[PDB]
Design a protein around this ligand. Sequence first.
Ligand code: HEM
Ligand code: HEM
Ligand SMILES: C[C@H](O)[C@H](O)[C@H]1CNc2nc(N)[nH]c(=O)c2N1
Ligand SMILES: C[C@H](O)[C@H](O)[C@H]1CNc2nc(N)[nH]c(=O)c2N1
Ligand SMILES: N=C(CO)NCCC[C@H](N)C(=O)O
Ligand SMILES: N=C(CO)NCCC[C@H](N)C(=O)O
Ligand SMILES: [Zn+2]
Lengths: 411, 407
Amino acid sequence: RFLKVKNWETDVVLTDTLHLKSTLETGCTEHICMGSIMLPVRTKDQLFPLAKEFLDQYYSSIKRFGSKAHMDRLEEVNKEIESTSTYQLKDTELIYGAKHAWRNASRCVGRIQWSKLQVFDARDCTTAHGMFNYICNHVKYATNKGNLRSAITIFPQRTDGKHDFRVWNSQLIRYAGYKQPDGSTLGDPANVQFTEICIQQGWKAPRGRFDVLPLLLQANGNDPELFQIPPELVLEVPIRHPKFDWFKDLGLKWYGLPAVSNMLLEIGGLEFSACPFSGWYMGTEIGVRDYCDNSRYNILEEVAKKMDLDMRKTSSLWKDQALVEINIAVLYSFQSDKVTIVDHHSATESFIKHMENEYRCRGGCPADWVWIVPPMSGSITPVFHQEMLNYRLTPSFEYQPDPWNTHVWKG
Amino acid sequence: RFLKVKNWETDVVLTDTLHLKSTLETGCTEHICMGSIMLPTKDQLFPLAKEFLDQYYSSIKRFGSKAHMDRLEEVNKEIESTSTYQLKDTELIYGAKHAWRNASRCVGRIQWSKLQVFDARDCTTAHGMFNYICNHVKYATNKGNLRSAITIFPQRTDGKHDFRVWNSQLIRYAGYKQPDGSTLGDPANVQFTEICIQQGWKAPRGRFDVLPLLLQANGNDPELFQIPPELVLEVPIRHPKFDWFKDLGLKWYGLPAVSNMLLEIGGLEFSACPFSGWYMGTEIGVRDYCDNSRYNILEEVAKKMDLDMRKTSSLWKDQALVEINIAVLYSFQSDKVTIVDHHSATESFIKHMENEYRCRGGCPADWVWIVPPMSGSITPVFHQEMLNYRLTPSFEYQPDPWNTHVW
Ligand code: HEM
Ligand code: HEM
Ligand SMILES: C[C@H](O)[C@H](O)[C@H]1CNc2nc(N)[nH]c(=O)c2N1
Ligand SMILES: C[C@H](O)[C@H](O)[C@H]1CNc2nc(N)[nH]c(=O)c2N1
Ligand SMILES: N=C(CO)NCCC[C@H](N)C(=O)O
Ligand SMILES: N=C(CO)NCCC[C@H](N)C(=O)O
Ligand SMILES: [Zn+2]
């Protein structure tokens, strides 16, 4: 069965056959669409099919499907499974796996870049200190003095579920939040819970508005341990505006490296619970969401105050005016300091080209419209007008529960 | 089967049970989400009628009364006898209000129970239709103080005697392709504009010509009529800061009146049911004015503003967009024509959702349509999880009649 998507701006119609390879469920039924819901110990049994499906896809990608090398690999994985109950990926299969998880990430607008990914194999890692060293190397390589390079570091896979490797941070680099006694928050409200854990684990918090968090790292199912990323490895950008000279006096800055570290990478039925990955920012992530969400830094009022906009009626669009100026500032600051960033016009246009190419070469491109359309100026970006099909392919990045909810403390 | 929706900004969680009453299908399966796709007999009729009458009698606290059973009996007898049935006025009104209440793409539903329902089921000709429509236009416009209204023409019979308004809204601007290669006026209306011309309309061939009505009664060939211009309230667009804005020569109409949809109540199909409320500013200023395939004015506005149009990263498009939208709102307000900004409308809708969850067990909503096309995440609906599903009575899409009609 063939499925059509249409772009309502261009009338370009595309045909999807890739969705036929989809296994994992969506959350939707014939009676309910859950397309806007944020979040809608494996046995030998289920494992060999998952391995096989993956190795068939790998061997096809390399034009060796059905070859002796393909068949010997299936056989060797099969024996390894029923003997040791799991298996190990070859380096080439891991790299391919990690790239495809990104290729298949339906909420990622940056996927035109999917094949340029530096994969760091950290499967020989055994301790939290080993992890810290790996993560430092990743930050330094990815940062590259502002000329950002996509990378992923992959710690050992899950075994019995009791020896998991985890990065407790939700991103490698992120700012602390501190609920105050009067009920206000200092710093980033998204990171209050995790900040409170670090403090409990013995971090001495500077208690400012932009304190880079320490890494809280769990190796081999052991209690996690704290480490400070050397400050010389943490690239940051002071935020100023090309025209408004008071803008710098808001005291704003952000870090250049967006490094999601709390997701789970599934490849061939194997579960890599610590797999921090980074690219570079689209300006709206910081300018729209991190700065202007009500539950984040929430700077809209203070900015609009300085701009002396009419704030007594929403229909002045004072919020919308302030929002553009803030986003101009983020992009200007990053460009001026020569740190990679992409604007939402450039990034969405690239994605449409990516998506069309994928339909031609691959038979489809799973995409989550709710996430792909940028959080400001939605309909003046080409994605708003693009119909999309969302379905789940493996290899994949998946959510997992926060480790503090599940971890059995050793003491 | 009992479903939670979370607001990620406020942490408020709502439990949805209303979805279990869902009748129609979404387009989605467990393998594929189609959430962003625009368009995803006697035997048939009695279940649909029963389901509707049951919810009606429940709504007036008479579920299982003799008057409930008697009406079920009487409708049943009438379908058996005539293969269709007629709604009582009270059922018609209830059904239309509920079709709006159920409209998952409508952000304006806090208003759902204040709807003036005009019963045009006695209408027989296109002239009749024109009369009913002018009355609706005048009623709803109300010299700028807009009132929600719907006008309901006769229900489908054998599908060869359909009433249709061929226009997509009661009031829209014409579109003409020129030698040029380009388009004058509204590109969305080019083909319908041609149909009018080929039917006999003398087009003034300008940028903002109000189209004629093309009206189909009882399955006949449709007929042209001009709405008295005195009934079409329009707003010149100026900006409260930029004097040059008026020189762009932009205007829009006050009454948004969708006329191409199909109202289904208790299995009956009302193929001409034009309805109107009032505008949210973004519909005009973001979509109608700035879509590349609509009036597409971003570039002219940005030039007038002397912004750096060399690079997308200067956010010149975004800057022009905000100002165009300030100008729309300012102009409607200055002229006392009802309009709502996207902050106000989305705040109301979040309140409406809480009311519906509390009093009804849920509120079908399509997040893709509900989130404004500008400044999405600085409105509260962006952060609101929504469940989309189909309840009846409903408004449904139907194919444009020119592909259907036998001349
Ligand atoms: C190279 C530049 C990249 C850009 C500009 C980019 C852009 C983005 C953006 C804007 C989002 C949404 C973020 C949010 O709203 O929180 C995102 C999500 C995501 N991207 Fe990327 N991306 C990039 C690289 C990568 C890389 C290297 C990977 C993994 C190898 C990746 C995988 C993801 C995943 C899994 C998500 C979903 C995260 C979630 O659900 O929280 N992307 N991308
Ligand atoms: C009172 C003021 C109202 C406001 C502010 C309003 C707001 C809106 C908006 C912004 C849309 C999206 C339109 C688009 O993007 O093209 C919409 C869609 C819709 N509304 Fe309303 N609405 C109002 C009244 C009504 C009324 C009176 C009805 C019917 C009785 C109705 C039924 C619908 C339907 C069926 C749609 C979806 C149409 C489609 O899919 O093209 N609304 N509403
Ligand atoms: C409820 C809703 O799904 C939620 O707010 C989503 C909307 N779209 C998003 N899109 C992106 N890219 N990132 C997000 O965090 C969200 N939040
Ligand atoms: C492809 C996508 O579904 C389409 O562009 C939608 C997106 N959201 C929308 N939302 C509203 N209110 N109106 C629209 O016409 C659209 N168009
Ligand atoms: N561009 C990326 C990954 O390359 N996004 C990662 C998520 C970052 C999050 N949205 C933030 O604002 O910190
Ligand atoms: N507010 C409404 C109906 O009350 N919108 C209906 C569709 C109008 C269309 N979006 C337009 O911009 O002309
Ligand atoms: Zn869906």
